[PDB]
Design a protein around this nucleic acid. Structure first.
Ligand SMILES: [Mg+2]
Ligand SMILES: [Mg+2]
Ligand SMILES: [Mg+2]
Ligand SMILES: [Mg+2]
Ligand SMILES: [Mg+2]
Ligand SMILES: [Mg+2]
Ligand SMILES: [Mg+2]
Ligand SMILES: [Mg+2]
Ligand SMILES: [Mg+2]
Ligand SMILES: [Mg+2]
Ligand SMILES: [Mg+2]
Ligand SMILES: [Mg+2]
Ligand SMILES: [Mg+2]
Ligand SMILES: [Mg+2]
Ligand SMILES: [Mg+2]
Ligand SMILES: [Mg+2]
Ligand SMILES: [Mg+2]
Ligand SMILES: [Mg+2]
Ligand SMILES: [Mg+2]
Ligand SMILES: [Mg+2]
Ligand SMILES: [Mg+2]
Ligand SMILES: [Mg+2]
Ligand SMILES: [Mg+2]
Ligand SMILES: [Mg+2]
Ligand SMILES: [Mg+2]
Ligand SMILES: [Mg+2]
Ligand SMILES: [Mg+2]
Ligand SMILES: [Mg+2]
Ligand SMILES: [Mg+2]
Ligand SMILES: [Mg+2]
Ligand SMILES: [Mg+2]
Ligand SMILES: [Mg+2]
Ligand SMILES: [Mg+2]
Ligand SMILES: [Mg+2]
Ligand SMILES: [Mg+2]
Ligand SMILES: [Mg+2]
Ligand SMILES: [Mg+2]
Ligand SMILES: [Mg+2]
Lengths: 52, 124, 52, 147, 124, 52, 210
RNA sequence: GCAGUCGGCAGAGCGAGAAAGAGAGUGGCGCGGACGCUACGCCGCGACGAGUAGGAGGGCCGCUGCGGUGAGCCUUGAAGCCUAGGGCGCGGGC
RNA sequence: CGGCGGCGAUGUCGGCUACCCACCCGACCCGUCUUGAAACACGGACCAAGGAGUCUAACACGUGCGCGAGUCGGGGGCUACGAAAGCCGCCGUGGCGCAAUGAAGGUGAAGGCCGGCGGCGCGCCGCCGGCCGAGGUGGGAUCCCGAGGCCUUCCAGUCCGCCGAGGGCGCACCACCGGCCCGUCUCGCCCGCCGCGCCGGGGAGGUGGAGCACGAGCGCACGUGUUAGGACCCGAA
RNA sequence: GCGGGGGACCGCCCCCCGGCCGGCGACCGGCCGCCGCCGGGCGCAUUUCCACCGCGGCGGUGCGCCGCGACCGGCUCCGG
RNA sequence: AGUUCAAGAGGGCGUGAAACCGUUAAGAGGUAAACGGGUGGGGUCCGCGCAGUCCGCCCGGAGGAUUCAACCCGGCGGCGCGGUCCGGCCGUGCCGGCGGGGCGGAUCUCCCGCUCCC
RNA sequence: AAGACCCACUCCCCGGCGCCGGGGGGCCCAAGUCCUUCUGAUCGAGGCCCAGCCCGUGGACGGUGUGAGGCCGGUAGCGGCCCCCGGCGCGCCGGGCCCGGGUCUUCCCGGAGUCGGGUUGCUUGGGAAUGCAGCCCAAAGCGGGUGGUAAACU
């Protein structure tokens, strides 16, 4: 925690270095998708096979 | 740029969304409260926005906040801002062509004589 | 020739980035087992033994 | 990586991407910048206007440190000092204006591009632009010449 | 998370076999031995495994526990089932369905119990 | 992420000591296998003795 | 032949450059050998500092660098004279000497004199015969507390006279910096020709009476 | 198109010519239910398919050597080579 | 198909392919230069092994990664693999970027409103104060508001979700119009003082510029293209 | 007067607390409840579980090889 | 005949390809051979083919098994904050301070050294 | 540099000599040929309990009838021993050297067929001549050289 730092504190044993930043913070895509907020905004799924 | 684009009338309490980098601008004296979603925010821009009382979101948080992007202002950086576009256009050496040429160095003996002065033959 | 560019300089921020990412991955049990280390009985994966 | 190069997909094709009619010969057109006034003249005039000819005075022994004058604009003028320097000057009421020596930070001349924030300042430089000094006077402030 | 670990190991795991236009995962709790996100037995918080018992009779079922995810010593709970075939499938189906424990692996585990039990019944 | 658990520090005989170190934040860094492989493919060329 | 829009390049590869190519495969070997020579020197001059003698404060010339101070070759003879150090004992007690350097100003002279008097205050001088101390040699306490110094001896730093926030006066608010620069350039450009014109029109107008 | 495998915490819909809600409140026994989803995956419709020079993509095509990996193979027989044997792949090849 | 038949253990069943043979139709020998090759154009008797777009540098553009108005330690230094990796920040010297223009001397990137005063004859032509303040027009992905409405006996009656006439703010970008900076030209009136000068500054209108007009660069890697190098390989007199 | 030391301020960080709030699904314990599984008892055979048999039915898949028929549907070429 | 695991390694000898040649076997043969498409015939082997498939449920038939359900004990696991059960830990959360510290700052201001001055 | 006036220590080095505490070379230093088994040969395969065969600061490598941490040489180790050659300290004899800083006064001081000029030729980024050389001219001393445009004045 002093070699590379936390996010609140920089690296004590490096000159100017902080921990890299997450481009997304919650990576649980399944937990994101089946959460209620997205599901109320989704349209109805079209699950039916219309073959020739 | 993000300050002035959310500054427009009717864009209050509303989230700035960019699918690129939010970089700092040091010729900015006052930073108002901004709710921002971006791919990357530069470290000083994070400090300025968070010390301004704002929120920085990422896109997975944006999806849980607004699943259809309601209350959003989608923004872009200047897509002609790179220096390649000053070289792009009409060929320099044709009339009324304000295109930067490719020079190894700039100076009085670097691409200034023949096609660029009326005295040295001709001027375009 | 000898003067082929044998050596590659990597940016210092990226070298610390890769050290950060490899350390972060060395604490998730799926990734080290997918590396093939036999850890199915270690008592905790960031396996810290005391300083003796 | 030689394995991502185009030469791996060109194995089995006779002319190696250089044509059967006009081949890959040695130097068809001269070496380097040959014919820049004769047969490459259209390219040289269309893309490099002013390449040929001789303009302006010679200066035989040029010392580039002599004309060294790195400039700064007024929009980055407060970036030379810290943030508490600006906010303490903002909150105090005695009119005690901070000094920005741009020679100290590494610039010799002040040009005036941006808007300058409404509070007094004393700016020291070796040279000033007219628009820079009139903007510092307009915001309230002083321009101090140093050497 | 699990999707991130999957995006790491989906092509660069040691359990990956890519031969003869097929793909298999030799992971210990991978029902169907399939390199998939769903059937991967390492990246999930909740995993089911089914394999033969230590002695040659019976089917042991493996459930991943909720707390010690980073603690592989106490993580998996093993239960040997030495019953008849219908009772063994009833036990596995009740462990998966009544617990609601990762319920899309129900008949992958049921069919694996059936395959191990058939492999344990001797040939003439 | 931001949640940092309490790693148990183990002893000579392998059982868990009473000690606890909170998890360093470098273990919550973005795990970027493309960047790690880029850093690996460029730093591993740096020990190469020349041949000609 | 040139293609479309691109730079005109002049590569200096028209000579037989491949004989005189200097690869750097002995770079970590040179670094490791220079390091061992440095530690061998530091071990040889065992209480004397490893980097070398003390170097004075010099102002760089040639306006790009004249705000910056740095380490010069040696203290000049008038600096040693004002510090009261003989110019031959200076190099024996560890002072760099530059005979060639003039002084043109008092302040750099005095700053390096005070540097010399700050260095002789720190100098722990071992006696020349080890079982018999002499008149000016250091005492046995600082002999036993002598160490080998690393880095430059009292390293040279840029000091900045930081100015507090002042109330701006009306004289500084009325001073016209750009106008004074333009008039300064005009007066410097026109000093000789105006003097010639004044002298000519002064001496030739005496023809009215002579 | 598919994260909707939304299951005794159940109710299994969304091809149907016509903008939108199978919305919610309040006054007037027997313990069951195929497959799927390497999301760089899988599925469905429709149209199309000449090719020199040339360009681009995919190669679970091939050689050598290095870094990881396969608790890999191997003197109960490796590489190589031969083969009227068995095959796979549009093919490179295996 | 919730229809059937026949043949089987030492002579038969199947094996599209795989070896040989038979027959019908098709079928001139490849590579190359060429408008045109099977050519009475050249190279090739046969087989094995070797055998030709590489590397370095520079530049351009595209793409990937990191950081980002900065970026970069490459040179130096400190502490088996390891000649690696880690560190240095008062090692960012320096490079490129953040500013251009002029031959150069040089100069160097918004302004308007209000209070006070035919000097002239800034009603016009400067400075004292305060305030507001970085342009506009058209198009413009997205987004915002909502006249009304999306049934289950029927009137209400609320909340949520959805749709929506119309009206908005308008990203990037394009086109146009203004604006600002340097060169140069034309016209014309002023303003300054330590030295009032062959001084210094300003305005209006055009016009030349590789500019500004709220950044986008740097480093690394990959790919193509153009070069300088033996430069895809072999070849002179 | 210089340079340096001391102090204050400001910002950030770390640690004690006092209080809300969030998470424990990258990160838990204790008891209580409901469930499921494992083991050991009691239960004792119109239950359960094994293995065989019928040319058994039901539903799926295929017949060893060589064949034929039937109707359904699609595209066609004709004819009355 | 002998050595050797092996002369199927015999002193230019490990492996021993192709071109080319000898012999054996089989097939063929007047439009030089060779090839593409389509069959047919004969061989070489292969399928260790040659009375041909099991799987799930139910019915019947005899057989075997100390065997099912339900209740008791113990262990393990999963899951309303059990509205507001008890306690911890963590926060890219915040507020409070009779708080106790590090770092930084171009934010301000008692002692020492040093330089002129009697 | 010398004189006068003050201030201030008697220790540097040579030639010999004896005494005290890095370099070459030589010789060495852990532990399986344990029990079965494959084989032409094993260094392969299995096993070695309650010390999970033994050593491991040694699991580099090579050799030995495939494949070896433990068979051998080696490897590791601030591991050992014996010579040799230094370097480094103290001590003795002889010899040398019998030495300075400050203040004031009085004296003194410089490299020529060289610089420099012209011309020629070569060279350089050096452009009315950067350097060199030949030839011709040919110095001065408050002088000379340089101060990247030839020349005069300052
Ligand atoms: Mg082609
Ligand atoms: Mg050709
Ligand atoms: Mg090509
Ligand atoms: Mg051509
Ligand atoms: Mg042609
Ligand atoms: Mg070429
Ligand atoms: Mg011509
Ligand atoms: Mg071309
Ligand atoms: Mg040194
Ligand atoms: Mg085609
Ligand atoms: Mg024919
Ligand atoms: Mg040809
Ligand atoms: Mg012809
Ligand atoms: Mg032909
Ligand atoms: Mg003919
Ligand atoms: Mg020919
Ligand atoms: Mg021939
Ligand atoms: Mg070959
Ligand atoms: Mg790029
Ligand atoms: Mg090495
Ligand atoms: Mg190009
Ligand atoms: Mg060649
Ligand atoms: Mg080339
Ligand atoms: Mg030749
Ligand atoms: Mg043999
Ligand atoms: Mg042999
Ligand atoms: Mg042989
Ligand atoms: Mg015959
Ligand atoms: Mg063994
Ligand atoms: Mg060995
Ligand atoms: Mg061996
Ligand atoms: Mg062993
Ligand atoms: Mg041994
Ligand atoms: Mg040994
Ligand atoms: Mg040794
Ligand atoms: Mg020359
Ligand atoms: Mg002069
Ligand atoms: Mg001159």
């Amino acid at each position: 925690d002093d070699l590379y730092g936390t996010w609140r504190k920089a690296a004590s044993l490096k000159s100017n270095y902080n921990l890299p930043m997450h481009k997304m913070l919650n990576t649980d895509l399944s937990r994101i998708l089946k959460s209620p907020e997205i599901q109320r905004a989704l349209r109805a799924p079209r699950k039916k096979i219309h073959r020739r | 740029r993000m300050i002035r684009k959310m500054k427009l009338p009717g864009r209050e309490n509303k989230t700035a969304v960019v699918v690129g980098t939010v970089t700092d601008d040091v010729r900015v004296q006052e930073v108002p409260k901004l709710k921002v979603c971006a791919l990357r925010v530069t470290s000083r821009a994070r400090s300025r926005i968070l010390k301004a009382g704002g929120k920085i979101l990422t896109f997975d948080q944006l999806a849980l906040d607004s699943p259809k992007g309601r209350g959003t202002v989608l923004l872009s950086g200047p897509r002609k801002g790179r220096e390649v576009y000053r070289h792009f256009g009409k060929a320099p050496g044709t009339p009324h062509s304000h295109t930067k040429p490719y020079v190894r160095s700039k100076g009085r003996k670097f691409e200034r004589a023949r096609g660029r002065r009326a005295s040295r033959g001709y001027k375009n | 020739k000898t003067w082929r560019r044998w050596h590659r300089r990597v940016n210092t921020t990226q070298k610390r980035y890769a050290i950060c990412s490899a350390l972060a991955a060395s604490a998730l049990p799926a990734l080290v087992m997918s590396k093939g280390h036999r850890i199915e009985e270690v008592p905790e994966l960031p396996l810290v033994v005391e300083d003796k | 990586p030689s394995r991502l190069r185009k030469t791996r997909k060109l194995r089995g094709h006779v002319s190696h991407g250089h044509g059967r009619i006009g081949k890959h010969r040695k130097h068809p057109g001269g070496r380097g910048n040959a014919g820049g006034m004769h047969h490459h003249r259209i390219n040289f005039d269309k893309y490099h206007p002013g390449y040929f000819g001789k303009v302006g005075m010679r200066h035989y022994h040029l010392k580039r440190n002599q004309s060294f004058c790195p400039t700064v604009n007024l929009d980055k003028l407060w970036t030379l000092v810290s943030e508490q320097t600006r906010v303490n000057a903002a909150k105090n009421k005695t009119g005690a204006a901070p000094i920005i020596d741009v020679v100290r930070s590494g610039y010799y001349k002040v040009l005036g591009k941006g808007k300058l924030p409404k509070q007094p300042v004393i700016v020291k430089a070796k040279f000033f632009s007219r628009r820079a000094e009139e903007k510092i006077k307009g915001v309230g402030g002083a321009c101090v010449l140093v050497a | 998370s699990a999707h991130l670990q999957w995006m790491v190991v989906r092509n660069c795991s040691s359990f990956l076999i890519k031969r003869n236009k097929q793909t298999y995962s030799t992971e210990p709790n991978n029902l169907k031995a399939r390199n998939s996100f769903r059937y991967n037995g390492l990246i999930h918080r909740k995993t089911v495994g089914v394999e033969p018992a230590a002695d040659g009779k019976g089917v042991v079922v493996v459930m991943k526990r909720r707390s010690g995810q980073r603690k592989p010593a106490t993580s998996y709970v093993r239960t040997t089932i030495n019953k008849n075939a219908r009772a063994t499938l009833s036990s596995i189906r009740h462990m998966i369905r009544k617990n609601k424990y990762h319920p899309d692996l129900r008949m992958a585990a049921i069919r694996r119990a059936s395959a191990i039990l058939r492999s344990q019944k001797p040939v003439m | 992420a931001c949640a940092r658990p309490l790693i148990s520090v183990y002893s000579e005989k392998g059982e868990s000591s009473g000690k606890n170190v909170t998890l360093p934040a470098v273990f919550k860094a973005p795990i970027r296998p493309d960047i790690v492989n880029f850093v690996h493919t460029n730093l591993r060329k740096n020990n190469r003795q020349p041949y000609a | 032949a040139p293609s479309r829009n691109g730079m005109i390049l002049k590569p200096h590869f028209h000579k037989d450059w491949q004989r005189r190519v200097a690869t750097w495969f002995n770079q970590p070997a040179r670094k490791i050998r220079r390091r061992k020579a440095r530690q061998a020197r530091a071990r040889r001059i065992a209480p004397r500092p490893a980097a070398g003698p003390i170097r004075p404060i010099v102002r760089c010339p040639t306006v790009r660098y004249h705000t910056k101070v740095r380490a010069g070759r040696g203290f000049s003879l008038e600096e040693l004279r004002v510090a009261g150090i003989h110019k031959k004992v200076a190099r024996t007690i560890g002072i760099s000497v530059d005979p060639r350097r003039r002084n043109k100003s008092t302040e750099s002279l005095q700053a390096n004199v005070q540097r010399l008097k700050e260095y002789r205050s720190k100098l722990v001088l071992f006696p020349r015969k080890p079982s018999a101390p002499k008149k000016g040699d250091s005492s046995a306490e600082e002999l036993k507390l002598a160490t080998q110094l690393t880095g430059p001896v009292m390293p040279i730093r840029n000091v900045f006279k930081k100015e507090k926030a002042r109330v701006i006066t009306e004289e500084e608010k009325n001073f016209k910096a750009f106008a004074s620069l333009r008039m300064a350039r005009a007066n410097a450009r026109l000093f000789g020709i105006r003097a010639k014109r004044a002298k000519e029109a002064a001496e030739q107008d005496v023809e009215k009476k002579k």
